[PDB]
């Protein structure tokens, strides 16, 4: 009897299980590197730290491109900005200027610590009014980090109850949900095969965001002083007047860069905060010691500063541990080969798509002890007196040309938020018995199912007010 003709073949089922984990499972059969061909596009997947650092660092310039996608084109205004732009003059320029702006907050008046703590304070006040109740903390946190990133881009911040915050929240959730059904890595291109209204919806959410950026520019346009350079829109409008690289600083090119920064700044930070609280509800023992640590090394004489990350070591290890278990980007932003190159001495043609399975690096059992468990202790020496780096297979913020540019902002944000809340609130399981599911929801960002927290002001915090 003959075998039957085979038109196509995929190694696992679509839309079954998370993509980053189905790839990681295949490595038992095929090794840490393998490829898939979808028509003419060929995709290479990589799930070992040595091969990944070759792609990201050693040959980082050979694989610094970005593939083209229908949804990303719409959300990137046709591959402008940074995250979704291909490697070239536009991406080079805007990435540098964005990195350059972050320098404007090292210390002084707008010391990033000051801006951040200004909004955490307002955050804690609004939360303290819910003393005794179970709430979803997504939106209060959303507002806090929305204002930090707004002060950094525009030197403006939204007053309490500004409906424009709810409008931003709305299209942020619309874009994220239509950008990709699950992760950005989809074997089958479904939206080109079946009749669907996906791109129509994405265009309409994008339209509301873009029309909002145009209005924000036009007012700032008639307020820009070439001597005042206090934010990112200044840094970007400055470089424009100098070009008269004028072609790559058009109004849209600036629009899209601010967009990638405003977006990333809110959605990544908010997501990691929710993940952290969720893990601590499942891990009361760790939470208790976090209270102990912050009470011993900060007490209640003052509110926590960046300085405290030298003595609040367990809180640092908890943040590092969430970024390992539930990376914001378990497969990063897909890369592309700008030229013919190789990985582990394997041929890789120009234009090939390359994906680093960061989920695989963070769960490699030869590199981590019990990687499925949430053990912040793994980042502490056995005595708990100094942070460590237990595995080289650890890259929450990526590496190389395409690495995160908001890491400094991110780490300071996550630390100050968690330190202020733990100093001040008992964060307990709601009165109903429900805990948050840690399974997660893979989108362009690795989100968690929304959940509620019973929040109480700490008795230790009430005392010391006398
Ligand atoms: C815990 C928080 C965060 C994590 C874990 C994280 C991680 C990452 C990763 C893994 C990448 C790309 C890796 C790759 O493509 O090779 C990336 C890129 C990027 N991140 Fe984040 N990030 C975080 C927060 C932020 C924040 C707060 C900002 C604020 C501006 C930001 C802005 C960006 C941008 C613009 C890119 C694109 C880089 C490029 O394409 O060259 N990220 N981040
Ligand atoms: C999609 C978006 C969040 C929703 C906004 O309405 C549009 C944002 C964007 N405009 O198209 C830029 C995206 C951001 C989502 C997060 C992104 C993809 C991001 C990132 C993602 C994961 C880790 N670090 C950074 C870079 C661009 C950021």
Sign for the pseudo-dihedral over CA of 448, 311, 99, 123? positive
User: Exposed e or buried b for every residue in 387-415, given b needs 16+ CB within 10 A?
Assistant: eeebbebbbbbbbbbbebbbebbbbbbbb
Which helix (H) or strand (E) covers residue 41, if one does? strand 41-46
What the block records as the tokens of 210 is 């873009």
**Alpha carbons 53 and 212: distance in angstroms, whole number:** 39
Concatenated DSSP letters for 150-169? HHHHHS--PPTT-HHHHHHH
CA angle 19, 404, 114 (to 5 degrees): 125
**Alpha carbons 445 and 322: distance in angstroms, whole number:** 14
Residue to mutate (ligand 2; options 164, 178, 444; most atoms within 8 A of CB): 444
CA angle 305, 306, 311 (to 5 degrees): 90
On the CB side of 251, how many CA atoms lie within 13 Å of its CA?
Answer: 10
**Alpha carbons 177 and 395: distance in angstroms, whole number:** 26
Taking CA atoms only, the protein residue closest to ligand 2 atom 27 is 260
**Alpha carbons 231 and 236: distance in angstroms, whole number:** 9
Q: Which residues does ligand 1 sit against, CB inside 6 Å?
A: 82-83, 95, 260-261, 264-265, 268-269, 272, 323, 328-329, 332-333, 396-398, 402, 404-406, 409-410
Q: Which ligand is nearest to the CA of 99?
A: 1
**Alpha carbons 20 and 39: distance in angstroms, whole number:** 22
Report yes or no: 324 and 362 within 8 Å, Cβ to Cβ.
Answer: yes
What the block records as the tokens of 359 is 């989920």
* 346: three-class secondary structure by DSSP: strand
Concatenated DSSP letters for 381-445? -TTSSSB----S---TT--STT--S-HHHHHHHHHHHHHHHHHHEEEE--SSS-----S-EESSS
**Alpha carbons 343 and 54: distance in angstroms, whole number:** 7
What is the 8-class DSSP label of residue 334? P
Q: How far is the CA of 330 from the centre of ligand 2 (A)?
A: 14
Q: What is the resolution of this structure in A?
A: 2.6
**Alpha carbons 433 and 349: distance in angstroms, whole number:** 54
Using the atom order of ligand 1, give the atom closest to the CA of residue 409.
27
Using the atom order of ligand 2, give the atom closest to the CA of residue 82.
27
CA terminus-to-terminus distance, the chain = 89
Q: What are 44's strand-pairing partners? A: 35, 354
Residue to mutate (ligand 2; options 94, 172, 213, 263; most atoms within 8 A of CB): 263
Centroid of chain to Cα 199 = 23
What the block records as the tokens of 161 is 């109850």
Concatenated DSSP letters for 13-38? -TTSS-HHHHHHHHHHHH-SEEEEEE
Contacts of 197 (CB under 8 A, 6+ apart): none
* 446: three-class secondary structure by DSSP: strand
Measured in degrees and rounded to the nearest 5, phi and psi for residue 199 equal: -65, -35
Centroid of chain to Cα 272 = 8
CA angle 399, 401, 406 (to 5 degrees): 65
**Alpha carbons 268 and 280: distance in angstroms, whole number:** 19
Residue 172 assigned ligand-binding role: yes
Concatenated DSSP letters for 281-323? HH-HHHHHHHHHHHHHHTTTTS---GGGGGT-HHHHHHHHHHH
What is the 8-class DSSP label of residue 363? H
What the block records as the tokens of 262 is 């405003």
**Alpha carbons 416 and 131: distance in angstroms, whole number:** 21
**Strand duo 133-135 + 41-46: pairing:** unpaired
Residue to mutate (ligand 2; options 83, 94, 184, 213; most atoms within 8 A of CB): 83
**Alpha carbons 211 and 171: distance in angstroms, whole number:** 12
**Alpha carbons 93 and 77: distance in angstroms, whole number:** 17
Taking CA atoms only, the protein residue closest to ligand 2 atom 8 is 263
* 330: three-class secondary structure by DSSP: coil
**Alpha carbons 89 and 194: distance in angstroms, whole number:** 36
* Ligand 2 proximity of 259 Cβ (cutoff 6 Å): yes
**Alpha carbons 129 and 208: distance in angstroms, whole number:** 33
Taking CA atoms only, the protein residue closest to ligand 1 atom 42 is 406
Report yes or no: 151 and 231 within 8 Å, Cβ to Cβ.
Answer: yes
Strand order through the sheet with 425-428: 133-135, 453-457, 425-428
Centroid of chain to Cα 113 = 20
| 402-to-117, 232, 351, 414 alpha-carbon distances in Å | 29, 20, 17, 22
Report yes or no: 381 and 71 within 8 Å, Cβ to Cβ.
Answer: no
What the block records as the tokens of 81 is 């900005």
Domain layout of the chain by residue ranges: 1-466
Using the atom order of ligand 2, give the atom closest to the CA of residue 205.
6
- Please write down the long-range contacts of 72-78, taking CB distance under 8 Å and 24 or more positions apart: 72/179, 72/184, 74/199, 74/202, 74/203, 74/206, 75/175, 75/179, 75/202, 75/206, 76/256, 76/260, 77/210, 77/252, 77/255, 77/256, 77/259
Centroid of chain to Cα 459 = 34
- Three-state DSSP string of 45-102: EECCHHHHHHHHHHCCCCCCECCCCHHHHHHCCCCCCCCCCCCCHHHHHHHHHHHHHH
Using the atom order of ligand 1, give the atom closest to the CA of residue 399.
16
The experimental method is: X-ray
What the block records as the tokens of 378 is 């793994």
1-466 adopts what CATH topology? Cytochrome p450 (1.10.630)
Q: Which of 191, 176, 196, 184 is nearest to 18 (CA)?
A: 184
Taking CA atoms only, the protein residue closest to ligand 1 atom 40 is 83
**Alpha carbons 263 and 248: distance in angstroms, whole number:** 21
* Cα dihedral 360→281→308→231 (10° resolution): 70
Using the atom order of ligand 2, give the atom closest to the CA of residue 179.
1
What is the 8-class DSSP label of residue 197? -
Q: Which ligand is nearest to the CA of 336?
A: 1
On the CB side of 290, how many CA atoms lie within 13 Å of its CA?
Answer: 29
Q: Which stretches of 129-228 are DSSP H helices?
A: 138-154, 163-179, 198-221
**Alpha carbons 352 and 337: distance in angstroms, whole number:** 5
Q: Which ligand is nearest to the CA of 98?
A: 1
**Alpha carbons 33 and 45: distance in angstroms, whole number:** 6
Q: Which ligand is nearest to the CA of 270?
A: 1
Report yes or no: 293 and 285 within 8 Å, Cβ to Cβ.
Answer: no
Q: How far is the CA of 400 from the centre of ligand 2 (A)?
A: 19
Report yes or no: 202 and 95 within 8 Å, Cβ to Cβ.
Answer: no
Report yes or no: 439 and 286 within 8 Å, Cβ to Cβ.
Answer: no
**Alpha carbons 358 and 371: distance in angstroms, whole number:** 13
Report yes or no: 423 and 300 within 8 Å, Cβ to Cβ.
Answer: yes
**Alpha carbons 359 and 357: distance in angstroms, whole number:** 5
Q: Which ligand is nearest to the CA of 260?
A: 2
Q: How far is the CA of 202 from the centre of ligand 1 (A)?
A: 22
Using the atom order of ligand 1, give the atom closest to the CA of residue 414.
1
């Amino acid at each position: 009897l003959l075998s039957l003709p085979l038109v196509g073949s995929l190694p696992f089922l679509p839309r079954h299980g998370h993509m980053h984990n189905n790839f990681f499972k295949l490595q038992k059969k095929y090794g840490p590197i393998y490829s898939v061909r979808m028509g003419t596009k060929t995709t290479v997947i990589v799930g070992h730290h040595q091969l990944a650092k070759e792609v990201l660092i050693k040959k980082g310039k050979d694989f610094s491109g970005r593939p083209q996608m229908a949804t990303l084109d719409i959300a990137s205004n046709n591959r402008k900005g940074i995250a979704f732009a291909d490697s070239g003059a536009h991406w080079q320029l805007h990435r540098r200027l964005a990195m350059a702006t972050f320098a404007l907050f090292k210390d002084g008046d707008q010391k990033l610590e000051k801006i951040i703590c200004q909004e955490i304070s307002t955050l804690c006040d609004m939360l303290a009014t819910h003393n005794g109740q179970s709430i979803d903390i997504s939106f209060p946190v959303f507002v806090a980090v929305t204002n930090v990133i707004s002060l950094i881009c525009f030197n403006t911040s939204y007053k309490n109850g500004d409906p424009e915050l709810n409008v931003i929240q709305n299209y942020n959730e619309g874009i994220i949900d239509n950008l990709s059904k699950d992760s950005l890595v989809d074997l089958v291109p479904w939206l080109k095969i079946f009749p669907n209204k996906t791109l129509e919806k994405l265009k309409s959410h994008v339209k509301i965001r873009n029309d909002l950026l145009n209005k924000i520019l036009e007012n700032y346009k008639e307020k820009f002083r070439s001597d005042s350079i206090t934010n990112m829109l200044d840094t970007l409008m400055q470089a424009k007047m100098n070009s008269d690289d004028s072609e790559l600083l058009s109004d849209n090119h600036i629009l899209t860069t601010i967009g990638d920064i405003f977006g990333a700044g809110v959605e990544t930070t908010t997501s990691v905060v929710k993940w952290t609280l969720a893990f601590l509800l499942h891990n009361p023992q760790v939470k208790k010691k976090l209270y102990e640590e912050i009470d011993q090394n900060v007490g209640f004489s003052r509110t926590p500063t960046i300085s405290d990350r030298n003595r609040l070591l367990l809180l640092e290890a908890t943040i590092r541990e969430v970024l390992r278990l539930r990376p914001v980007a378990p497969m990063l932003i897909p890369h592309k080969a700008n030229v013919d190159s190789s990985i582990g001495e394997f041929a890789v043609d120009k234009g090939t798509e390359v994906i680093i399975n960061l989920w695989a690096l963070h769960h490699n059992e030869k590199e981590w002890h019990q990687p499925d468990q949430f053990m912040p202790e793994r980042f502490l020496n056995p005595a708990g007196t100094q942070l460590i780096s237990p595995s080289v297979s650890y890259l929450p913020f990526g590496a190389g040309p395409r690495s995160c540019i908001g890491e400094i902002l991110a780490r300071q944000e996550l630390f100050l938020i968690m330190a202020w809340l733990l100093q001040r609130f008992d964060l307990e399981v709601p009165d109903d018995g429900q805990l948050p599911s840690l399974e997660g929801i893979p989108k362009v960002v690795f989100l968690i199912d929304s959940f509620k927290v019973k929040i109480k002001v700490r008795q230790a915090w009430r005392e010391a007010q006398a």
